[PDB]
Amino acid sequence: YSDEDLVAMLDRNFTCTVSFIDGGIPYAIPMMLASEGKTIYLHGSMKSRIYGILKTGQLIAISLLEINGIVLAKEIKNNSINYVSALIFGRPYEIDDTEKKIEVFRLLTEKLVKGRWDNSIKPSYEDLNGVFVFAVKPETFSMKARTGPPHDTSTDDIWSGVLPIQHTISEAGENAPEYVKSLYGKRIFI
Amino acid sequence: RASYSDEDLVAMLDRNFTCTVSFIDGGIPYAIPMMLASEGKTIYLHGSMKSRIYGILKTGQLIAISLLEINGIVLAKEIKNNSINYVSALIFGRPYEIDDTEKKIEVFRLLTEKLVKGRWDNSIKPSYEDLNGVFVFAVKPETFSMKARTGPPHDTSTDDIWSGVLPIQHTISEAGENAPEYVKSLYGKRIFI
């Protein structure tokens, strides 16, 4: 896998787990994932504990996980999960330029629902008072995956195969805008 | 908002078969995905003894186990009110190694029945040799916390802007008509809820 594989996985997710060390123990907390290329943007309230953690500039681990199938092998020990995962290391740095904060909210909103930013009330500089934004570029990263059928080593009459797990946007209202309705039934995280 | 209910944690453990495990290794935090066996509040981790995670678990250091369920995109009239509907858990515990093969067998049966109920019975069970190659640790929670958002967006504006929740569904799809009935009973089932 390459940089392009990481960007592709970043492009298709809007959440992540952020792991860090605090008082000598590891914490893991879920966060919204804005990105553009390999750069990750995290945001939240400056009144939160995570703000202070990120302001330190300490190394954080950002991880991503996509679950795609249950692998039923003939033997219990060969059962598995088809999945894709990434672990990204980086050192956060604060974005203070309010106009760049607005742009990061635009990147996020467009990852979620293309066309929504143009048809909604955008944040004011007053709204972004007290909201942090940190950029994280990868120091290092790795990825792992499993795909495909089970590996059976035997002739036994036991059914084997993969039970696919689909992630889909479902119906939110027939009288929603077309940029929303056009997502109904769409498979995501894929 | 937040929860600290045991009944809540067990419910979430019961309906998830994966987790993220976060740990410190040479003063560097790591986070790796793992299969989640569980019984009540007790979590069982398993894997290859050739893995780096084995040595970490052998230390008995405090580890952080996290769960995350994503249920919808919340679109408010104001971008600043957009969010995600989700449920999350963060569990802290100190692992201990299970040494007897019978308890290891029980753990594999528990995991198998959580993935596909009915499958253990109709599948080749691990040999004693096989079990000697797989580690199993019990992790009992020392502390834990949970957080969730549900429901519609929050707004004050009167503007003519559609607002609502785009549900995200996680479903098992069809694996073929020749599958046994215990497998076919999962076709179309929505999970992680």
Residue whose C-alpha is closest to residue A44's, from B2, A53, B30:
A53
3-class DSSP state for residue B123? Answer: coil
Among A residues 39-58, those touching chain B with beta carbons less than 8 Å apart: none
CB atoms within 10 A of CB B184: 14
Question: Bridge-partner residues for A126, per DSSP?
Answer: none
Instruction: Quickly tell me which residue has 């190694």 as its tokens.
Output: B97
Least CB–CB distance from B164: residue in A21, A70, A173: A173
Choosing among B25, B30, B66, B160, which should be mutated to test the A contact, i.e. which has the most A CBs within 10 A?
A: B66
Q: What is the rounded CA–CA span in Å between residue B62 and residue A23?
A: 12
Q: Which run of H or E residues covers position A181?
A: helix A178-181
List the structure tokens of B167. Answer: 């549900």
- B179–A contact, CB cutoff 8 A: yes
Q: How far apart are CA B37 and CA B16, in angstroms?
A: 9
Q: Residue A164, class by beta-carbon neighbours within 10 Å (0-12 exposed, 13-18 middle, 19+ buried)?
A: middle
Helices (H), ranges, chain B: 6-15, 52-59, 101-115, 128-132, 181-184
* Contact call for A159 and B180, based on CB within 8 A: yes
Q: Do A167 and B170 touch (CB under 8 A)?
A: yes
User: CA B12 to CA B68: how far, in whole Å?
Assistant: 9
Q: How far is CA B152 from CA A130, A172, B70, B162, in A?
A: 24, 11, 15, 12
Confirm if A145 and A54 have CB atoms less than 8 A apart. no
In angstroms, how far is CA A6 from the centroid of its own chain?
11
Domain ranges in chain A are 1-190
Candidate from B20, B78, B166 with C-beta closest to A28: B20
What is the rounded distance in angstroms from the CA atom of residue A46 to the CA atom of residue A132? 6
Chain B nearest C-alpha distance from A76 (Å): 6
Assess B11–A contact: CB distance below 8 Å, yes or no.
no
Task: Return the structure tokens found at A164.
Answer: 């696919």
Amino acid at B182: Y
Tell the CATH superfamily of the A1-190 domain: Electron Transport, Fmn-binding Protein; Chain A (2.30.110.10)
Contact A189, A12 (CB under 8 A): yes
Alpha helices in A13-97 (DSSP H): 49-55
CATH for the stretch B1-193: 2.30.110.10
Are A163 and B178 inside 8 Å of each other by CB? no
Q: Is the C-alpha dihedral spanning A33, A37, A39, A43 positive or negative?
A: negative
Could you give the 3-state DSSP secondary structure of residue A172? coil
Nearest CA in chain B to A161: B175
Give the gyration radius of chain A's Cα atoms. 20
Name which of A33, A69, A51, A46 is nearest A161 in CA terms.
A69
CA–chain centroid gap for A39, Å, is 12
Largest Cα span, chain A: 68
Using CA atoms, how far residue A177 sits from A26, A123, A181, B123, in Å, is 43, 21, 6, 49
Q: Using CA atoms, how far apart are residues A65 and A156, in angstroms rounded to an integer?
A: 33
Interface of B with A in 131-150 (CB under 8 A): 134
